[PDB]
Amino acid sequence: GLKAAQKTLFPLRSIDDVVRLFAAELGREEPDLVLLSLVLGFVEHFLAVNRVGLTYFPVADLSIIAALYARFTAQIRGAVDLSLYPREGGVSSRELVKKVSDVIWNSLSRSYFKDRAHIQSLFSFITGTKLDSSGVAFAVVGACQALGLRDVHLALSEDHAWVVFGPNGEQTAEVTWHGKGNEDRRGQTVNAGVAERSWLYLKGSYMRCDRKMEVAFMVCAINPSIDLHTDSLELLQLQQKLLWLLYDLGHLERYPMALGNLADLEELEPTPGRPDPLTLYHKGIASAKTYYRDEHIYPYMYLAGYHCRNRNVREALQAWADTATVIQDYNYCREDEEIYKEFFEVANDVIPNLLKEAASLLEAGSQGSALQDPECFAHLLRFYDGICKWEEGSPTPVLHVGWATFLVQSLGRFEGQVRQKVRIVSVPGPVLTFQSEKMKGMKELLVATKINSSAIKLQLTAQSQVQM
Numbered sequence: 001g002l003k004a005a006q007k008t009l010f011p012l013r014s015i016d017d018v019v020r021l022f023a024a025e026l027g028r029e030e031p032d033l034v035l036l037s038l039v040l041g042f043v044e045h046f047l048a049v050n051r052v053g054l055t056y057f058p059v060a061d062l063s064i065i066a067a068l069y070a071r072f073t074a075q076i077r078g079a080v081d082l083s084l085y086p087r088e089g090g091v092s093s094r095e096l097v098k099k100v101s102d103v104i105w106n107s108l109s110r111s112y113f114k115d116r117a118h119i120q121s122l123f124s125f126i127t128g129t130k131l132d133s134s135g136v137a138f139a140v141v142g143a144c145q146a147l148g149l150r151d152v153h154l155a156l157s158e159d160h161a162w163v164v165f166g167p168n169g170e171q172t173a174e175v176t177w178h179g180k181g182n183e184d185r186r187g188q189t190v191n192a193g194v195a196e197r198s199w200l201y202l203k204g205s206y207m208r209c210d211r212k213m214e215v216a217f218m219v220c221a222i223n224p225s226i227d228l229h230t231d232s233l234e235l236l237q238l239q240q241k242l243l244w245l246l247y248d249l250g251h252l253e254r255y256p257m258a259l260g261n262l263a264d265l266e267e268l269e270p271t272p273g274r275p276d277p278l279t280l281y282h283k284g285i286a287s288a289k290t291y292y293r294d295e296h297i298y299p300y301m302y303l304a305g306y307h308c309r310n311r312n313v314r315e316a317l318q319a320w321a322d323t324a325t326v327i328q329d330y331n332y333c334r335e336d337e338e339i340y341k342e343f344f345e346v347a348n349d350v351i352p353n354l355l356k357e358a359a360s361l362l363e364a365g366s367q368g369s370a371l372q373d374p375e376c377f378a379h380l381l382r383f384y385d386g387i388c389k390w391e392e393g394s395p396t397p398v399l400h401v402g403w404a405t406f407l408v409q410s411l412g413r414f415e416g417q418v419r420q421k422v423r424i425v426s427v428p429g430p431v432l433t434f435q436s437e438k439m440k441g442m443k444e445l446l447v448a449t450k451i452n453s454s455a456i457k458l459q460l461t462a463q464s465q466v467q468m
């Protein structure tokens, strides 16, 4: 409306006043996404974008929030005539959804840095005419709810956003851009992407949000960064509390990455009486396994990063091998580059630095060292096997000589007597089966006393010939 009952909690004078607002909206049949996004972008603006004047918490007076709310709703209602788009079943049509998308798109500034911080909210849309990629999709959803279109919902994969709608919520529509350069399928289904088994569309195991999960998304979208070096403590705490509130209400059940975000926040600043980060990261993984057929990559990476920051080398390598075990059943397609970059950085920067440190600490007399544990070697091998398998049948290559260099260095960190304890068995403590043809052909090289660097390179990149 706003409705009288949504107004009684104003002004919001503190973090807990914001949380109380979220609680009361989440009590409702339909939490108000426009109200809540405006409030978050407001508080984010005055705690991270401009802190001038801040003495505690930027007071969100009803007069300010209501006028922002009225601007959004007038802008949408004025520009979308619902009577031109008749609704059977209480469900929306593709043309209606496209028009709402076009409205949001056309309101945006022509040129701006599309990956700035703080352009995710309806606050940024209204005050700055700017939105990031997935912010456009959220905004389309908000606009749809404000028009009474309750079939329209946010869909998310690990790197993109679109909408679902229509009979049984079975239709999909592209409403925003993806990445740098991707030309458009705006208005189309995602079924081509699903059918080609790219990571971008998660072989169809992407998130189909209900309203509560859309609130969870805007809370994950809170960006506490003030600059490269500094975070807003007030926004970190707000985000954390909001996530716990969503957790207790059961609204993070089908949101794996939200559980990873919470775990990260708990590591930074733990809440007395709550599960530890590890429990959290494992619920994020169990959520992916239960609702998304274990087809998601980030739950394992979040866990891996935690183990990496704490120097549990063994556990970090296990998590990354689990990561690769997911990716192996995808095809590497155009538009999957963000997950290529994540794997590239693991293999070729993070793991080599972890293992270099472990080599020094071994020289310094460390026991139980990753580099003396054959299970750690097996995890490293499983990691690469999954990447190799991922590459098979993909329309674009993954591996090249730049990866081979780090592979050779990483294998060399483990002595022969440690590498030879891994048992590699065929289809048809440490025991390991390779699914990839590259790693199967490599198996003897990997356990040789002397690592044959040139042969490993040839096997990893399938380079036919050596120097004339």
Ligand SMILES: NS(=O)(=O)c1ccc(OCCCN2CCC([C@](O)(c3ccccn3)C3CCCC3)CC2)cc1
Residues within 6 Å of the ligand: 134, 156, 157, 158, 159, 160, 161, 217, 218, 220, 221, 222, 257, 298, 301, 302, 304, 305, 306, 308, 342, 346, 350
């Ligand atoms: N090197 S590592 O330790 O293995 C590691 C690497 C990446 C990691 O990434 C964790 C961050 C994952 N991130 C969260 C924001 C998320 C997203 O950027 C986002 C943005 C806004 C709100 C919710 N999610 C997406 C969701 C789909 C569309 C945008 C994309 C995935 C963690 C660890």
